[PDB]
Amino acid sequence: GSGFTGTLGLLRLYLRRDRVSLPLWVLLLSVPLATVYIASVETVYPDRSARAAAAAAIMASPAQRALYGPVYNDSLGAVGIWKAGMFHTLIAVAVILTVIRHTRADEESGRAELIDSTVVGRYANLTGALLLSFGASIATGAIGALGLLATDVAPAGSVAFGVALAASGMVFTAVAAVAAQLSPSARFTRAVAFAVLGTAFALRAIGDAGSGTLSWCSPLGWSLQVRPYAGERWWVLLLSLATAAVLTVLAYRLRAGRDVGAGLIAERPGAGTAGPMLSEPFGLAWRLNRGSLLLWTVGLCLYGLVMGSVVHGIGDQLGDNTAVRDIVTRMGGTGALEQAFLALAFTMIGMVAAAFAVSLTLRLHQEETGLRAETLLAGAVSRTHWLASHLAMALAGSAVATLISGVAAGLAYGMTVGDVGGKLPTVVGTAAVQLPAVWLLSAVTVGLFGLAPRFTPVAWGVLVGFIALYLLGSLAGFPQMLLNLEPFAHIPRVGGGDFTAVPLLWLLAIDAALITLGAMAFRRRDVRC
């Protein structure tokens, strides 16, 4: 009987509890490297003279260098792996969630007092979670390295990139393990870990856009100073490992002087009464949603600000029929690529805003299935006064997260060119004309919630189902009749001629009809709980 007894049993339990979520992000984060990034770069940039130009173009744009990082030479690997520098961030996100799912938010639920009343040691749970996360990171690194070794690149750089990707996940596994010991609340620990990740990312980006000395002071940044395909600095790797080791030790110490229930931070009281604004199922929805609106709005505004700078410069450092004058001329504005690229770039923001609008409407299904809709509707609340307080939030939140993004992109474009009073109205209109398409997947979700509540989450599968028709229908073969079954293709284009405004009406009518049926079919529906 040791302090580590029951580690393998707990590890087996943790694998089952997420036997489907783990392989998805292990594969979806490692296999789409050699089949998506290097393949596309080889297609677009055939020879060396077309790659030196791209590298020199990247070196004259801090707004584009800070997001991904520098390019040190013009080889196929170094240019094709540049945009993969975001993976180092994504994997970190993943591992953080995993740890906080299995160590905290398992004590908070009360299950890790029932588990600790069986034959398990004091340190079995933390060790099991650490083993799971370290193994997942090593596995995704190995699969990525194999996939890259199955292509035409330097064989000594694929290994370096795989090891860097593994180490960047191990370090943040360690930081998540340390953060899980700090507060009784899982939300607080998630916030702390993500704050550390965010400040690391910002400290990396500031250094990449400038001299480069500051980027050495961030765990992200140690990963891309290994420089795969550009002359590898191997000694950087054991500069991350050491860090992880230290943090891991600290985690165990913070567990050795703690009780199972909670420890190390007290929470904040503060509201003994309800202010004049919590009396309605409209104020309660505002309280339940404001944080997510803030997060999504900031993210979309920042992404639009990033995309606004790139629009000018693409017109020169791209084109010349480098295999982009064929897909941009179809998906985009069919003309001046400075406007075609803008029209193509705002469709991605529209898709992200649609994904945003789906969540605030699934909040309704979460409320009902949590046995709180019965508590609300057992009062003097109309059945349509409720469900008009989450629909309003979804519509009016996705209608501002897109307009703010358009404003940011317009400001960036105007400053880059020098004239802002000309580009800003057109960019704002381009952002605005995407709303009728984004208000589906809210109309659709409401339609499902009221005819078949249990099949409400399939509204995710619809959204993805639309996206695959946009890409795999315009990037591949099409009968032109299977591509007319998505709302993002019919969005007209602002600026110049051939603005029709007819599809907007046909989408607004469908939105209104779907919402009307989803509301009429819900007020004659037995509240199923």
Partner 1 sequence: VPIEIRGLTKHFGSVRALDGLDLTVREGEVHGFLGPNGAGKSTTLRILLGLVKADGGSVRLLGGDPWTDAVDLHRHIAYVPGDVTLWPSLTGGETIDLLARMRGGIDNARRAELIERFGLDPTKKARTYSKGNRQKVSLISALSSHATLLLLDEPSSGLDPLMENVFQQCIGEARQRGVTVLLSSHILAETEALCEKVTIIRAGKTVESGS
Chain residues that interact with partner 1, rule: CB under 8 A: 1-2, 5-6, 9, 13, 16-17, 109-111, 113-122, 184-185, 259-261, 267, 269-274, 278-281, 284, 287-288, 370-372, 374-383, 524, 526-527
CA gap 247, 126 in Å, rounded: 13
| Contact predicate 141/215, CB 8 Å | no
To which residue do tokens 């296999």 refer?
31
Return the one option of ligand L9Q, ligand CDL, partner 1, none that residue 352 interacts with (CB less than 5 to 8 A, by type): ligand L9Q
Find the shortest distance in angstroms from Cβ 359 to ligand L9Q: 5
Find the shortest distance in angstroms from Cβ 109 to partner 1: 5
Q: Candidates 27-35, 47-55, 325-333, 409-417 — which segment interacts with ligand CDL by CB under 6 A? A: 27-35
Question: Which of 12/187 has CB closer to ligand CDL?
Answer: 187
445 binds ligand CDL (CB under 6 A): no
Among 256, 298, 315, 244, residue whose Cα is nearest residue 57 = 315
Phi, psi for residue 153 in degrees, rounded to 5: -145, 180
Find the shortest distance in angstroms from Cβ 449 to partner 1: 16
Among 386, 388, 390, 384, residue whose Cα is nearest residue 357 = 390
CA gap 359, 395 in Å, rounded: 11
Find the shortest distance in angstroms from Cβ 136 to partner 1: 18
190 binds ligand CDL (CB under 6 A): yes
388 binds ligand L9Q (CB under 6 A): no
Find the shortest distance in angstroms from Cβ 370 to ligand L9Q: 10
Beta-carbon contacts of residue 19 (< 8 Å; ≥ 6 apart): none
CA gap 483, 471 in Å, rounded: 10
* The residue type at 507: L
303 binds ligand L9Q (CB under 6 A): yes
Among 177, 243, 208, residue whose Cα is nearest residue 61 = 208
168 binds ligand CDL (CB under 6 A): no
Contact with ligand L9Q (CB under 6 A): which of 295, 482, 502, 520? 295
Question: Which of 105/166 has CB closer to partner 1?
Answer: 105
Return the one option of partner 1, ligand L9Q, ligand CDL, none that residue 516 interacts with (CB less than 5 to 8 A, by type): none
Find the shortest distance in angstroms from Cβ 362 to ligand L9Q: 7
Find the shortest distance in angstroms from Cβ 132 to partner 1: 16
Contact with ligand CDL (CB under 6 A): which of 32, 263, 429, 453? 32
How many chain residues interact with ligand L9Q (CB under 6 A)? Answer: 10
Beta-carbon contacts of residue 186 (< 8 Å; ≥ 6 apart): 100, 104, 105, 108
199 binds ligand CDL (CB under 6 A): yes
Contact with ligand CDL (CB under 6 A): which of 8, 119, 195, 468? 195
Among 88, 80, 219, residue whose Cα is nearest residue 151 = 80
Contact with ligand L9Q (CB under 6 A): which of 135, 184, 283, 299? 299
Question: Which of 115/193 has CB closer to ligand L9Q?
Answer: 193
Contact with ligand CDL (CB under 6 A): which of 54, 105, 251, 463? 105
Contact with ligand CDL (CB under 6 A): which of 3, 12, 15, 28? 28
Count Cβ atoms within 10 A of the Cβ of residue 398 and give its class: 0-12 exposed, 13-18 middle, 19 or more buried.
Answer: buried
Angle (CA) 420 424 425, round 5°: 135
To which residue do tokens 């390295």 refer?
145
Contact with ligand CDL (CB under 6 A): which of 134, 161, 201, 413? 201
Return the one option of ligand L9Q, ligand CDL, partner 1, none that residue 9 interacts with (CB less than 5 to 8 A, by type): partner 1
According to DSSP H, which parts of 210-282 are helical?
219-222, 237-256
CA gap 170, 173 in Å, rounded: 5
Phi, psi for residue 92 in degrees, rounded to 5: -55, -55
CA gap 436, 491 in Å, rounded: 9
Q: How far is CA 479 from CA 116, 145, 301, 485, 490, in A?
A: 60, 38, 36, 12, 16
439 binds ligand CDL (CB under 6 A): no
355 binds ligand CDL (CB under 6 A): no
Question: Which of 119/295 has CB closer to ligand L9Q?
Answer: 295
How many chain residues interact with ligand CDL (CB under 6 A)? Answer: 25
Q: Candidates 62-70, 108-116, 296-304, 426-434 — which segment interacts with ligand L9Q by CB under 6 A? A: 296-304
Task: Mark 491-519 as b/e (b = at least 16 C-beta within 10 Å).
Answer: bebbbeeeeeeebbeebeebbeebbeebb
CA gap 22, 46 in Å, rounded: 36
CA gap 227, 78 in Å, rounded: 8
Binding residues for ligand CDL (CB under 6 A):
18, 21, 25, 28-29, 32, 36, 89-90, 93-94, 97-98, 101, 105, 187, 190-191, 194-195, 197-199, 201-202
Binding residues for ligand L9Q (CB under 6 A):
292, 295-296, 299-300, 303, 352, 355, 359, 366
